[PDB]
From a paper:
DNApre, generated on the DNA-I by incorporating ddNTP without 3′-OH, failed to attack the incoming dNTP (dGTP, dGTPαSe-I, or dGTPαSe-II), thereby forming the substrate complex (the substrate–primer-template–polymerase complex: nat-dG_sub, dGSe-I_sub, or dGSe-II_sub), resulting in the before-reaction state (without the bond formation) retaining the absolute configuration of dGTPαSe. In crystallization trials, DNApre-I (generated form 5′-CAGGATCCT-3′ with ddTTP, without 3′-OH) and DNApre-II (generated form 5′-CTGGATCCA-3′ with ddATP, without 3′-OH) could not be extended by attacking dGTP or dGTPαSe diastereomers in the crystallization conditions, which allowed the dNTPs to just bind and retain their absolute configuration. Firstly, dGTPαSe diastereomers were synthesized and separated by reversed-phase-HPLC as peak 1 (dGTPαSe-I, eluted first on HPLC) and peak 2 (dGTPαSe-II, eluted later), and their absolute configurations on the α-P center were determined as Rp and Sp, respectively, by X-ray crystallography. Further, when we compared the substrate structures containing native dGTP and dGTPαSe-I, we only found the Se-density difference in the electron map, which indicated the Rp configuration on the Se-modified α-P center, determining the absolute configuration of dGTPαSe-I (Rp diastereomer). As two metal ions occupied the MeA and MeB sites, and they coordinated with the Rp atom in the dGSe-I_sub structure, the electron density on the Rp position was reduced. The distance (in the dGSe-I_sub complex) between the Rp Se atom and MeA (or MeB) was 2.3 Å (or 2.6 Å), while the corresponding one (in native dGTP complex) was 2.0 Å (or 2.1 Å), confirming the interaction between the Se atom and the metal ions. Furthermore, we found that on the phosphonoselenoate group, the P-Se bond length was 1.9 Å (single bond), while the P-O bond length was 1.6 Å (double bond).
Author numbering:
A (entry chain A): 1 to 21, 26 to 174
B (entry chain B): -1 to 174
Write the structure that this text describes.
DNA sequence: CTGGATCCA
DNA sequence: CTGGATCCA
């Protein structure tokens, strides 16, 4: 376990130091998610989402992730979930990395921000409008629903739900 | 697990044909041997097998929640590695030796598709499926599908399925 | 080629 | 609710 402040600190050390095979990952594209983003006093792990600017790269980003400076082991890894165990200040913490292509970023932030309870209510509701929501996009009947949106707040509003901040979602 | 000869596998099966059963809210229910079908390397009559693969035909959709989850082999000592409604992998003690026993299930209307799938070998299944992929079809242990939709075929048996799909019917021992 | 059990996210 | 990684069938 870690405190919110520990998580926040850890993130910052990482914001500069992410990269992949030798290509750096802009901090602009790293987004803290999960219990950290919701600003819980206590966290179990740090959950980071990474925005990939093009579809080809997913085969390479998490599979060839590079944290310049840090000691760590990889539990499991694929193109969309890589779970790392980092040695931080003589202690071991879990670091979960996820990816989203550019056009997915809001859908993903919304999904990975959580909490789960909130996601279930939201998702349950959308089934009866024939819609399907997830981390990738919004879909009607096995088809992508193109929304003229950039951010999470815009996604949440456009979907037709009340925009609440992460700390006040459950 | 450990290796067995075709004859060992065949023998094992027979001991099992009469001894399979299941609980279903506390009624202890036997599984007809008529509904047990040897599959995998045994059915292909390879000289040597790695495990015995048995397919079980379930006559009613409700029962799947109960059959493999509450499987009963009357007489045998065994441990369960993993188990769900469709794959249950068992390790049986047979004659002071441990062998793997993989149980699968198919509903009635699935039986040919399942037999075909589980009969294998894998290499053969890939060629076959690749070809059907190119006509915009999808083959499964469950059925045949075009564009996420079931393709109803006038068929009963595996040979009829294989033929109807539009492939040359070869017997299990000569598939690869 | 295609999917199942497990155990996560 | 909805889907991912792994190790299998
Ligand atoms: N749809 C869906 N999404 C899920 C689920 N579990 C986690 N997630 C997402 C939402 C979470 O904010 C995010 C991180 O998951 P996690 O297991 Se790490 O829980 P989290 O909310 O961060 O709290 P903490 O890590 O336990 O402190 O992943 C889930 O079961 N269903
Ligand atoms: N489509 C598809 N089917 C597969 C696959 N692996 C096993 N199967 C099916 C076909 C096999 O006949 C059956 C059992 O597989 P298994 O790994 Se246990 O080997 P099997 O072919 O029985 O011979 P043996 O067990 O090695 O002696 O399950 C697969 O990857 N794709
Ligand atoms: Mn977390
Ligand atoms: Mn996590
Ligand atoms: Mn086998
Ligand atoms: Mn097997």
């Amino acid at each position: 376990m870690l405190t919110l402040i520990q998580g926040k600190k850890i993130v910052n050390h990482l914001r500069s130091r992410l990269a992949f095979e030798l290509i750096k990952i802009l901090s602009k594209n790293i987004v803290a998610v999960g219990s950290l983003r919701r600003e819980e006093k206590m966290l179990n792990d740090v959950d980071l989402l990474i925005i990939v600017p093009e579809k080809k790269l997913l085969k390479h980003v998490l599979p060839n992730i590079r944290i310049k400076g840090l000691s760590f082991s990889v539990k499991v890894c694929g193109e969309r979930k890589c779970v790392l165990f980092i040695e931080w200040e003589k202690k071991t913490y879990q670091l979960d990395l996820f990816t989203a292509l550019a056009e997915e970023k809001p859908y993903a932030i919304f999904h990975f921000t959580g909490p789960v309870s909130y996601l279930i209510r939201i998702r349950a509701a959308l089934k009866k409008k024939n819609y399907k929501l997830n981390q990738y996009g919004l879909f009607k009947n096995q088809t992508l629903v193109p929304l003229k949106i950039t951010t999470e707040k815009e996604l949440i509003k456009e979907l037709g739900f009340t925009y609440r901040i992460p700390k006040k979602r459950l």
